[PDB]
Structure 1
Amino acid sequence: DIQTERAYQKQPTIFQNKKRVKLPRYYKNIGLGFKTPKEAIEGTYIDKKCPFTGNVSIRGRILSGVVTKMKMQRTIVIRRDYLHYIRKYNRFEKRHKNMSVHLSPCFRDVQIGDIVTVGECRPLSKTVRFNVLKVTKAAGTKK
């Protein structure tokens, strides 16, 4: 199911060819009181940039956005809305800044409109500097 590309997909930490007579999984708690989810501990994907089961460390900023598009692979576009205060007219103006964000295959069923918390880490790509730490499903979505 995995190992679709040319090179062999594996977790570089663990050794998988111990002489004997299921594969163990590398994972870590990421601090700041975030819960290492179950698809990370139990699942069978290979992701360099998964913040729980991969080589990337969360440090600096922690922000939240709402999911806009999910079309490019293992990555989403979130949209961060705020108000900017002009001082001449004692009023605000509605602005937005949509940023590219790495979504782990851990967070399996995520829909658009979900309130996604992200954490800053080392530059992953040209435009990607953040990584999804948790997802809150949009108000309801029970039915």
Structure 2
Amino acid sequence: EQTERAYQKQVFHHHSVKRYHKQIGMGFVTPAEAIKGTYIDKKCPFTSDVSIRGRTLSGIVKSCHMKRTIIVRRDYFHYVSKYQRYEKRHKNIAVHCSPAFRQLKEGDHVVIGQCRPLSKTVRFNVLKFTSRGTGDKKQFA
């Protein structure tokens, strides 16, 4: 929890120190691991001061090799007017994943939501995750 040069403390820290956890908006239940958990994260949507604004997307988790941050691949179809046919496409989105989802792994469908720019590319935040099958390499966050 405290394995760094500076003291790791929550953005909203108070005595009774307490554990602070707000809840995000349109019907996303806060996970249990973020209530009793002792992790510290200033970018977690539940236990920090990052909102969840308009845009909301979904995709398949592909890469879980960066610290508390994952890559979400969205597959869709693009329509070409001349041929009246579709074509497969994809766009990778780098999204933050708080330690509240310990069981998240590569290949699991995840619902993500917009927040303020947290990095050069990271602008979305993980909201909920549904697990899927195994592929011989269980790579967790």
Q: Which residue of 2 aligns with 1:15?
A: 14
TM-score between both structures, scaled by the size of structure 2: 0.90
1:94 aligns with 2:57: no
1:122 aligns with 2:116: yes
One-letter code aligned to 1:9: Q
How many residue pairs get aligned? The number is 135
TM-score between both structures, scaled by the size of structure 1: 0.89
In the TM superposition, structure 1's runs of 4+ consecutive aligned residues that sit over 6 Å from their partners are: none
Q: Deviations over 1:44-84 (max 9, x none)?
A: 00000000001201011110010111001100011000000
SS at match of 2:105: coil
Q: Which of residues 124, 134, 138 is equivalent to 2:128?
A: 134
Q: Is the 8 A contact 2:96 2:126 kept in 1?
A: yes
Cα distance in 2, alignment partners of residues 6 and 139 from structure 1: 39
Provide structure 1 residue ranges, at least 5 long, that are not aligned to the other structure: none
Q: Which residue of 1 aligns with 2:21?
A: 27
Q: Which of residues 62, 73, 83 is equivalent to 1:79?
A: 73
SS at match of 1:43: coil
Q: Which residue of 1 aligns with 2:46?
A: 52
Q: Is the 8 A contact 2:12 2:48 kept in 1?
A: no
Identity %: 64
Cα distance in 2, alignment partners of residues 104 and 29 from structure 1: 14
Structure number with greater Rg is 1
Provide structure 2 residue ranges, at least 5 long, that are not aligned to the other structure: 136-141
Task: Please report how far the alpha carbon of residue 14 of structure 1 lies from its aligned counterpart in structure 2 after TM superposition.
Answer: 2.3
Q: Is the 8 A contact 2:117 2:123 kept in 1?
A: yes
Q: Which residue of 1 aligns with 2:31?
A: 37
**Aligned CA-pair RMSD:** 1.6
One-letter code aligned to 2:2: Q
User: Between Structure 1 and Structure 2, which shows a larger proportion of strand residues?
Assistant: 2
Q: Which residue of 1 aligns with 2:2?
A: 3
Cα distance in 2, alignment partners of residues 15 and 28 from structure 1: 14
Cα distance in 2, alignment partners of residues 5 and 130 from structure 1: 25
Q: Is the 8 A contact 2:115 2:123 kept in 1?
A: yes
Q: Which residue of 2 aligns with 1:65?
A: 59
